[PDB]
Structure prediction request, 1383 residues.
Amino acid sequence: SSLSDQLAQVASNNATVALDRKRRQKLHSASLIYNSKTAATQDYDFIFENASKALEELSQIEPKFAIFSRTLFSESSISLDRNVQTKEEIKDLDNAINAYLLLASSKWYLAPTLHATEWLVRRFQIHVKNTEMLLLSTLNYYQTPVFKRILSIIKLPPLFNCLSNFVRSEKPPTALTMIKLFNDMDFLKLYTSYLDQCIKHNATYTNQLLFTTCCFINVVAFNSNNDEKLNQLVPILLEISAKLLASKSKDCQIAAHTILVVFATALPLKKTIILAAMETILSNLDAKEAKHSALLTICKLFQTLKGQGNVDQLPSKIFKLFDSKFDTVSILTFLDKEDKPVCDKFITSYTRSIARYDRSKLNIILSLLKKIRLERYEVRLIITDLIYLSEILEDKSQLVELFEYFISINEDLVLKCLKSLGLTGELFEIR
Amino acid sequence: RIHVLKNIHRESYGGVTQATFLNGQPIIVTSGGDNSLKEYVFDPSLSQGSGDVVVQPPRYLRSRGGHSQPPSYIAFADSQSHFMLSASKDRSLWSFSLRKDAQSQEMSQRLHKKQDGGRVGGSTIKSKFPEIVALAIENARIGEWENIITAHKDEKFARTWDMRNKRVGRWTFDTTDDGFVKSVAMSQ
Amino acid sequence: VKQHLQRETQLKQVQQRMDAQRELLKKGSKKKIVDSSGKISFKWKKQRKR
Amino acid sequence: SLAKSPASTIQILGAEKALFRALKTKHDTPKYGLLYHASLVGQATGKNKGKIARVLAAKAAVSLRYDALAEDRDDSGDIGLESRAKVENRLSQLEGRDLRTT
Amino acid sequence: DEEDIALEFINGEKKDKLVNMNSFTSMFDNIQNVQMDTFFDRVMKVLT
Amino acid sequence: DESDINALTKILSTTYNYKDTLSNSKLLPPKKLDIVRLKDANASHPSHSAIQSLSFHPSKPLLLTGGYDKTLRIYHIDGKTNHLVTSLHLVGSPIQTCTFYTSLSNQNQQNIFTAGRRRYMHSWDLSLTAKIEKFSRLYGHESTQRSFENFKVAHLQNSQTNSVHGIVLLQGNNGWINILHSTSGLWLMGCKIEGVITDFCIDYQPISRGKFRTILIAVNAYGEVWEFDLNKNGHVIRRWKDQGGVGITKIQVGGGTTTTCPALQISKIKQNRWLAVGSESGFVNLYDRNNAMTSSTPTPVAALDQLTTTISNLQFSPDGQILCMASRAVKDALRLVHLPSCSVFSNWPTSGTPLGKVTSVAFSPSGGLLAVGNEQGKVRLWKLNHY
Amino acid sequence: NPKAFPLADAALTQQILDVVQQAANLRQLKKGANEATKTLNRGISEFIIMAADCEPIEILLHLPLLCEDKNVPYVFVPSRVALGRACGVSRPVIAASITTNDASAIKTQIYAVKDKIETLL
Amino acid sequence: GPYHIKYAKNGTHLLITGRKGHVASMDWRKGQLRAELFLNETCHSATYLQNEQYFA
Prediction:
């Protein structure tokens, strides 16, 4: 490499040190409130005292900023210089800055957080040192002047490369620019680690979940025509779906439901992946809107399932788990809705799992398959395992009235399954 | 799981037979039974704050190789006994150096453009030419135009190559009688 | 009024020829159809617009 | 008399002197007219305010001749409201594009 | 009759909506302060 | 740190592929085909004209090509070496439609019916000299049938015996379809539609064990469709109208037994699911006859618009999952539209497919295999790897 | 729709759309309601075809009002989709004006269809 | 070649000379070089004069 390249590397290392007055002015005029001519003449005491006022306002709004008043906004930090302590003190205060940023990511619509993080911008130089976490935290606010301001004063990371024509510009970045930003794979790994820290420290708020889910399903939509990009993309977004389903927020759970339903209708996933996805869906299902989205998600994920094995009995563990999260009244009511969801293959798998695993609730399967209409292969498999139920256990009135329903519609088909296995006079002598 | 390098070596010759990290280094040397020894390197991470979670996939670095199948034809490229052309049953034409084994290089099969401007046929999934029956090199006009003329197994035209560029040429000479090429020569 | 009529019909004819030329240079496949006299016309291929 | 006029006329309806000087010498005609002060054209910015002056005049011709020529009209804003939704999502889809390369 | 069973299995398949490049581009306009379940049914309306 | 709701994470950490593998699919994936190119079928023996019609055998690996050079050629097709079985040159009789007929009673006849712009139609009886007969008598109906070009061959049941016989169906001048016996040539019945008859197709529907019913589906140029029950006297049972569509060139059914996917055994006759009406602008309406037999102004499930000039072929694959639109007007105008999803495959044909000016197309009944004949005289051959 | 006066039957609408297709091939029609009204203003329209299929029909029934001032024939056909197919574009077409010409190849067909139109007025 | 090193008398600027020809005066602690000149004859040594503004 060349000498100017190696010197650009040492400039990028020494970016924040003010080595004379002109660099100090150019480096201290980068404010988030004031313009450059006021910001260059301000002091540390002035910006600290009104940032401490704004942190008291932000702390009486949300009381988790008081420990930042203890450490990051204390009065020892007026004289704390960033690039004079070692790497271990640097990583201490940079996870302090990361904690503040992913706590105050939600508060970015109210001016105390602007005047408070003004002091992180001007004392700790987080627009050029801790800049990836700053962009990732305020990414939701991209139509707003506060994201315009941080783009004007930011030094843009190499992963955020497509925002480089919207820095120091008067127009906001557009939604197609946001999808082009999210369309990378390394950016997707970065954003999923950011969400992992959000989910861990319990700071996921609904505007973030909406923006994140919108950009994720637009990434899947953009890559919907190349299977190798979809296959690069599956263990990233299904991993973040698992980590959103493994939390307590109903909003982040149905965000994961949205990601799972778009991804399963974008490409045909494996049967075992779909079953483990419904196990992870049911294993933390506690809300009601989450239950609504969870039933619709499990129905569509079973609908988008092809081949030999789409409508087996779902196994005993996952069927009794689905029973413990959704009883009979819930399933029957949801099928009785006039909007008519498409629940064909899932309801077939459900009734076959009832016939292999319950053997008491057969009047309810008569009522629900009276409600919704199925296909020929669905009802053929249903009456074949009802035939096997008749041959294993003694045939009472619930199985008899089920066969009366399967005689009252499509009696030629039940004749075809009895002639494929058994006989009609022998079956009438059975029951 | 960081990444998978698929088909890094041939399964038919053993798969990846020994892979080892040079220690302290982000470079890993693999070797397979297909007469090939490669190195792969990990570039530093592209995120300037996270790093440990955004792991850039391993890319290819230097490698040495030879024929994976026994060679089917042999010629000397020049009068100095420096390079020798060598074609194998694994459908590759190598140019091996008798002086320094780093100079050994596979002659490339990336075709030129058609002379009129029409489309060239062939499969989209590019495979190597049928294995070489004969060849004839005469480097009197070398670098000027096509220099090697070669004849492949059970196909009715003879390709040309350029030894200077180490690549295929623009011409495939037909036989014009629906017969396979049994011999080639070229004048001096 | 009669010379207003002559001016209007001459302007109609020259705008009609101008419009035929403009219509001709847009796009699509077409052929030059020649009649008995030599009054040429351009017949366009039966192909709808994508 | 406004309803039986084409949508291009409703586009250029205010700018008659600029229009007819730019036709009687062979120049470029205006694109806004009296319809420049609509709020949607206010929301647009660039050459696409000429573009949505055109689509706004088209939908305004639709709604205007519905209003003048209907008999079972209900004074409830339904056709104007669906036309406005069409113009708003069209304005969205041509403010979403950007001539920069990202 | 396994060919007849296979034909009725491929016959009982219903028309679905596929994801395009631009089936979800018009959601950023109304992800503003709506609830996430309203986002879920707005997505499900696109998918169905 | 650690030694050895997590179900999804575990299944992702074990799997490496994430899609359905090979044969646990059983129905086609949309938007990306899987179609290899084989040797061009008539490459062994070249054609001296544009290949006007093209049909596979119902059972044997045979492909019959034929065109305006008044010869018809049969090719044993395979992957590598599509050779020529036999070849018959009818002098003074250019052929336009040629069809393998194979009866349902004994499945041992193997006739070839062929016809062009003539007042006769030849019928070669396959015997591996060659015994061909000529049909040239409309039994009193010669004024309404001046050219035997557009015929189709179908099966018909007597409906008092369970005796089937083949019918040929000739499209005549006024609105007429003249149906006549495929062995004796006797005029059985005729069905007249009101307008300019442009095309027609044959649907079958089973009734009981060993009884089916034949329906002729004939389209006006304007877009109105008649369905005639013809296992009884040729009487109309349904008359509906195509939604949109003004210059109508070609109707086809599919998803069951068409005349191009024929049933070898009478119990294997199926009801067709799909019906595509393809037009002069390139618009192809697609109707789903599992619900669009009742409405009498039925709406299409989709109107395809991808190729912009006149639809001259549209054929359904035997499973009834692909429709093939094709136009003989411009070069490379062929699309394979997946269905039920009604979405065109976007990866084939590409800009480098040597389709030519597609003037005929045919689907194999068993192999999953397209033959596409162009105006240069070349049948190109492709294999769909789903089958 | 009730307020779409003269509506054509099947035979007349088939020959109307046939002359629309050959005028579209000869580049002699203006497709769309605004272009139809422009030809009505300029007096270079032979006859107007409209579609009795638009869900507000009042976006149409204003060019009748200046057809009956310039005594130019106008007619309704039942399908905007089929009118768009006949005009040879990919969109539905609500109205179409066949423009005037005196050297036109299809002048006799235009005159025959417009006489069949003005019989039912 | 081997680089003769020289610093300014306050440590702000660095002046390197290659043995072959490569003389570079630079602000080594920012990333600012202000002279990179390749004088293709064999240079031996250099020094600043009273500033980074002149060097011999």
Remarks:
- Chain E has two helices and no strands.
- The helical segments of chain E are 2-11, 36-47.
